[PDB]
Amino acid sequence: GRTRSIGLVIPDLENTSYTRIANYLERQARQRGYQLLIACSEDQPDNEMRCIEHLLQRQVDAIIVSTSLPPEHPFYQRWANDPFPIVALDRALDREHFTSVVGADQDDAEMLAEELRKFPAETVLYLGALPELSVSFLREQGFRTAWKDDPREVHFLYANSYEREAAAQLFEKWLETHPMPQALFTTSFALLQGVMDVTLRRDGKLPSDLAIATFGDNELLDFLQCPVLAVAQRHRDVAERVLEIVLASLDEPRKPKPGLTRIKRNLYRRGVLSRS
Amino acid sequence: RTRSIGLVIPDLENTSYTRIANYLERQARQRGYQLLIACSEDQPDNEMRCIEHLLQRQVDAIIVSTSLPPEHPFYQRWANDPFPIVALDRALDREHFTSVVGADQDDAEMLAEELRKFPAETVLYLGALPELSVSFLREQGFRTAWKDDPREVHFLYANSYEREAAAQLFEKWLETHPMPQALFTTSFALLQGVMDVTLRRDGKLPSDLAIATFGDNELLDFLQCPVLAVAQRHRDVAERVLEIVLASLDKPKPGLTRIKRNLYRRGVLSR
């Protein structure tokens, strides 16, 4: 009854994090005799639900999804007590009913923020997005823990989306009344790209006196002239775990106990720190 | 008819292939087709297995970037067959298959011509694997642009398109040659090795250096010297490849079809 196929619904194959996870999931699925069917949602809920339906129509045996919807959204509640495996990747689904393989956001932000705090800097800027979301709050809580005994006042700035242009416009507006920071903590690589876009437009280069700490990573940051700290997901491990959950959900009498499986990120020392 | 299309590529790590995959996925989905991606890791045996697997799944057509040469009997099975197999990047037999490939010679000529405009006494061309098609096409393009220029270009060839190999070879070359004021690299990986040696030695790149490279990326905006780079037109490539598949299904001429790269001015040239 098994088509030996597994759906993967992710926003795109642009974002390095998503391409890397797709890369490893495809490799590992093929090694177990499964064809991955990738369907990109463009991070849009209506598209995502359409992709889900299309994959069901193609009779995939299971679906791995990074959802753009709230974790408890009714659309997925259809599968809450059903044999059909839906496994969440990166962004959680209802921990009562689904297994989600996600980051250890609070801990990872604390670990990154503790490293950032080691750089002398008068002006410290925290740039996040969508502060009301659980994920955003957890990252800020981790940062605050790391900085709780530091006497510096940190500037908090929040974009309306985790998106490069939104960050650029907000940071550019911020610079009208604040100095360039000497320490910067960004909660997504897209936010950091917007800041870097403005800094390059304004100055033609990054300051040597700027310590950058970001979620997300790109080994090309090794070539920047300022200190850069980055936290990347353990893509290979996440892929192996998700597949193992999908196959256990198919191969065993009972599904894995629902809940979050939080996988720590790696901290990478980039920019001038790669030349220490 | 399953309204699905196989895509066999080395991996989803190479930003060339991920970008093409990204656009092929969107355009195929927009037409009701499901893309079935299979990664070969550039291994011939892996590739042949992936093809068979996709055939089992009754895909309507296959797009492949092959790790096999022309002349290999494998694809000869479909030489005169209604089933569409379309080549991407590496060409299949021109008598029988349509291949969407690079215009490497013309791209290298365009890039080299822009680099030639920079004042530079010492010019270094850094490539790899000079006997390979990709390598010789790019060299010929360069030499065409530099044909009547009085400067003697230094040619340097690494044993692979790899950062560490380039770093080692460039460090050795600097023992007896001055830092160039113009550098042409046939791959971004080679440029990375040159930047490794230069940054580790001097902590910065020279002001008096113009760089031209294949493999454009956003790091290049940060560089504090003039930079020229070429990049594939990924969306246009994906569109052409899907056009060919759909027309074969719903017939295109066998042979190579080439899509040129775009040129970007990066580093201090963005100012």
8-state DSSP, A19: H
In one letter, which amino acid is A165?
A: E
Q: Give the separation between CA B199 and CA B203, rounded to whole angstroms.
A: 4
CB-nearest partner of A13 from B21, B34, B192: B21
The candidate with the shortest Cα–Cα distance to A82, out of A63, A69, A65, A101, is A63
Q: Mutual orientation of helices A235-251 and A16-31 as an angle, nearest 10°?
A: 40
Cβ(B125)–Cβ(B139) below 8 Å:
yes
Q: Give the separation between CA B120 and CA A189, rounded to whole angstroms.
A: 37
The C-alpha of A157 sits at a distance from chain B's nearest C-alpha, in angstroms, of: 24
Cβ(B215)–Cβ(B187) below 8 Å:
yes
Site from A23, A31, A197, A212 to mutate, B interface, most B CB atoms within 10 angstroms: A23
Report chain A residues whose CB lies below 8 A from the CB of B37: 26, 36, 38
Contact criterion met (CB < 8 Å) for A224 and B224: no
Q: Give the separation between CA A233 and CA A215, rounded to whole angstroms.
A: 9
Site from A223, A235, A236 to mutate, B interface, most B CB atoms within 10 angstroms: A223
User: Three-state DSSP class for A6?
Assistant: strand
CA atoms within 13 A on the CB side of B110: 16
Contact criterion met (CB < 8 Å) for A13 and B29: no
Helices assigned H by DSSP within chain A: 16-31, 45-57, 74-77, 105-117, 134-146, 164-174, 189-203, 235-251
Q: Give the separation between CA B260 and CA B268, rounded to whole angstroms.
A: 25
Across-strand partners of B90? Answer: none
The candidate with the shortest Cα–Cα distance to A116, out of A240, A258, A231, is A231
User: Three-state DSSP class for A222?
Assistant: helix
DSSP per position, A87-133: EEESS---TTT-EEEEE-HHHHHHHHHHHHHTS--SSEEEEEE-TTS
Q: Give the separation between CA A96 and CA A74, rounded to whole angstroms.
A: 13
The answer to whether B56 contacts chain A (CB < 8 Å) is no
Dig out the tokens for A108 from the structure. Answer: 């990872």
Give the resolution value in Å. 1.9
In one letter, which amino acid is B237?
A: V
Across-strand partners of A211? Answer: A183
3-class DSSP string for chain B: CCCEEEEEECCCCCHHHHHHHHHHHHHHHHCCCEEEEEECCCCHHHHHHHHHHHHHCCCCEEEECCCCCCCCCCHHHHCCCCCCEEEECCCCCCCCCEEEEECHHHHHHHHHHHHHCCCCCCEEEEEECCCCHHHHHHHHHHHHHCCCCCCCEEEEEECCCCHHHHHHHHHHHHCCCCCCCEEEECCHHHHHHHHHHHHHHHCCCCCCCEEEEECCCHHHHHCCCEEEEEECCHHHHHHHHHHHHHHHHCCCCCEEEEECCEEEEEEHHHC
The C-alpha of A269 sits at a distance from chain B's nearest C-alpha, in angstroms, of: 15
Across-strand partners of B227? Answer: B211, B266
Cβ(B214)–Cβ(B186) below 8 Å:
yes
Q: Give the separation between CA B38 and CA B46, rounded to whole angstroms.
A: 10
Cβ(A35)–Cβ(A59) below 8 Å:
no
Cβ(B244)–Cβ(B100) below 8 Å:
yes
Dig out the tokens for B60 from the structure. Answer: 């309507």
The answer to whether B58 contacts chain A (CB < 8 Å) is no
Report chain B residues whose CB lies below 8 A from the CB of A225: 204
Q: Give the separation between CA B85 and CA B254, rounded to whole angstroms.
A: 11
Contact criterion met (CB < 8 Å) for A58 and B204: no
Strands B262-267 and B226-231, sheet pairing: antiparallel
How would you class A53 by CB atoms within 10 Å of its CB: exposed for 0-12, middle for 13-18, buried for 19 or more?
Answer: exposed
Measured from the Cβ of residue A248, the count of other Cβ atoms closer than 10 Å reads 15
Report chain B residues whose CB lies below 8 A from the CB of A203: none
Give all domains of chain A, ordered by start, each with its CATH number. 1-96 (3.40.50.2300), 97-276 (3.40.50.2300)
Sorted by sequence, the CB contacts under 8 Å of residue A226 that are 6+ apart come out as A206, A207, A208, A209, A210, A211, A212, A271, A272
In one letter, which amino acid is B245?
A: V
Dig out the tokens for B29 from the structure. Answer: 């989905």
The kind and range of the H/E element at A259 are strand A259-263
CB-nearest partner of B12 from A19, A37, A225: A19
